[PDB]
């Protein structure tokens, strides 16, 4: 089953009648127009290639704009690709809107999370700090010991060290979809999706039911 | 915190493989005084994009 390319507008809440504040994330999901359907004979697998949004005519390039004028479609801002399942067909310029999610109950919002920069091990891997007093010399937030004495004469691969934290793709799974507001092109999922405000979210229905 | 073998003039030259300067790309020609300057900076005579912004 395909998913739809959203955008994180922000977070707010939906009060029930009961007095239950549901933290929902307003994902606007505009019309996802297909640009290229892929098949087993030509492409080796089955998937559609959707796009969303609009883009400046002096900023789309001629290789990129010729890809859309083949499909008969307005130049969107990106090109995402959704693996089709079995018994599921779409055409070359069909516009897909948020009423696909109108009957699902849990989605998997995949976004590009925030960027914490070069972040040390107390922030990245949740190491403990060393003792802030009792004599500690220049070693309050360091990783400490990163190996053994001469039997491994090496740090092992996949060592938890400092470095870049975030700005990576992550997937938050099984978010309970609260409202499919197809009037104003929205989708409200209960919880905290990755990425900052205004980033692209790739909302797909849940693989784990 | 200190070496055990003197690194060669091969490794020194390879370390300096990225320490080479990139020149100026192109100088922008002003359209009134005609002289060349850095792109988006004023000239050395006080002109910028035609108009005289400050006397010399």
């Amino acid at each position: 089953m395909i998913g739809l390319v959203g955008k994180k507008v922000g977070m707010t809440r939906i009060f029930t009648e009961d007095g239950v504040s549901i933290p929902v994330t307003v994902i606007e999901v505009e019309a996802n127009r297909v640009t290229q359907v892929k098949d087993l004979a030509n492409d080796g697998y089955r998937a559609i290639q959707v796009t969303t949004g609009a883009k400046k005519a002096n900023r789309v390039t001629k290789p990129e704009a010729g890809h859309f004028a083949k499909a008969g479609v307005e130049a969107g801002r990106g090109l995402w690709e959704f693996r089709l399942a079995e018994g599921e067909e779409f055409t070359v310029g069909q516009s897909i809107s948020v009423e696909l999610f109108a009957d699902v109950k849990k989605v998997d919002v995949t976004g590009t999370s925030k960027g914490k920069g070069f972040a040390g091990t107390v922030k990245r891997w949740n190491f403990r700090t060393q003792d802030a007093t009792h004599g500690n010399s220049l070693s309050h937030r360091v990783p400490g010991s990163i190996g053994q004495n001469q039997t491994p004469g090496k740090v092992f691969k996949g060592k938890k060290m400092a470095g870049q934290m975030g700005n990576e793709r992550v997937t938050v799974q099984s978010l309970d979809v609260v409202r499919v507001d197809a009037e104003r092109n929205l989708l409200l999922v209960k919880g905290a999706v990755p990425g900052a405000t205004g980033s692209d979210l790739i909302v797909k229905p849940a693989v784990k039911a | 915190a200190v070496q055990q073998n003197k690194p060669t003039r091969s490794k020194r030259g390879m370390r300096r493989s990225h320490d080479a300067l990139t020149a100026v790309t192109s100088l922008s020609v002003d359209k009134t005084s005609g002289e060349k300057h850095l792109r988006h900076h004023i000239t050395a005579d006080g002109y910028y994009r035609g108009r005289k912004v400050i006397a010399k």
Binding site: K116, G117 | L38, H41, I42, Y48, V53, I54
Partner: protein
């Protein structure tokens, strides 16, 4: 991490920038074109240009604010008398950054920040 923040530090503590930009907002009003570095000029726009928007209503309450932001009466007597009705219709953008190359002492990117209606 500097997510969504604004305001350069300029390697100065917060009681120095407030007393550096106050000297620099005065000297930009007094001379109408000053040559400073490019980050100290881009942060000067957030100080001088609100001192000219304050100058569009000559009142005793606004004289005492523009004197609290500058502590120089000659600068306040130029903001409200001269630079007030000089920029009486311009919706912001009261001053102009003119990049002027590099400084021969420390290779700083310099700039001329001038008022718009100077010459």
């Amino acid at each position: 991490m500097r997510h969504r923040k604004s305001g350069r530090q300029l390697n100065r503590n917060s009681s120095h920038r407030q007393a550096m930009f106050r000297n620099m907002a005065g000297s930009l009003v007094r001379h109408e074109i000053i040559k400073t570095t490019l980050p100290k000029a881009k942060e000067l726009r957030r100080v001088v240009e609100p001192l000219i928007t304050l100058a569009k209503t000559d009142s005793v309450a606004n004289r005492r604010l523009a004197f609290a932001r500058t502590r120089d009466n000659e600068i306040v007597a130029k903001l409200f008398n001269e630079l007030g009705p000089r920029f009486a219709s311009r919706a912001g953008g009261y001053t102009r950054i003119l990049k002027c190359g590099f400084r021969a002492g420390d290779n700083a990117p310099m700039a001329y920040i001038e008022l718009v209606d100077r010459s």
